[PDB]
């Protein structure tokens, strides 16, 4: 059913928490979004100070893989770090 034409795009959001180490979030940003350290740190800080930030905007499938991978990587490392998606 439905239609055609452009795909819907999705924002990948990182949410702030009080317990995930900053160093860890930086690592996530390099590892899963190809940020260098400089940009990664600034983005971590945007999250830290603003409570949430957009890490990237992607097609639905790419976005979901990022989110799934980010959250799995956080839990496996015993951090509550939450990554979520938003339709752009």
């Amino acid at each position: 059913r439905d239609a055609l034409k452009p795909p819907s795009m999705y924002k990948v959001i990182l949410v702030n928490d009080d317990y995930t180490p900053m160093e860890f979030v930086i690592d996530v940003l390099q590892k899963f979004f190809s940020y260098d350290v400089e940009r990664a740190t600034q983005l971590m800080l945007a999250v830290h100070y603003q409570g949430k930030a957009i890490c990237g905007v992607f097609t639905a499938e790419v976005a979901e893989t990022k989110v799934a991978m980010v959250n799995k990587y956080a839990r496996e490392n015993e951090h509550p770090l939450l990554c979520t998606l938003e339709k752009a």
Partner: peptide, 10 residues
């Protein structure tokens, strides 16, 4: 997030 004093180069 939580810092551990590194820190931070940005």
């Amino acid at each position: 997030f939580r810092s551990k004093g590194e820190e931070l180069f940005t």
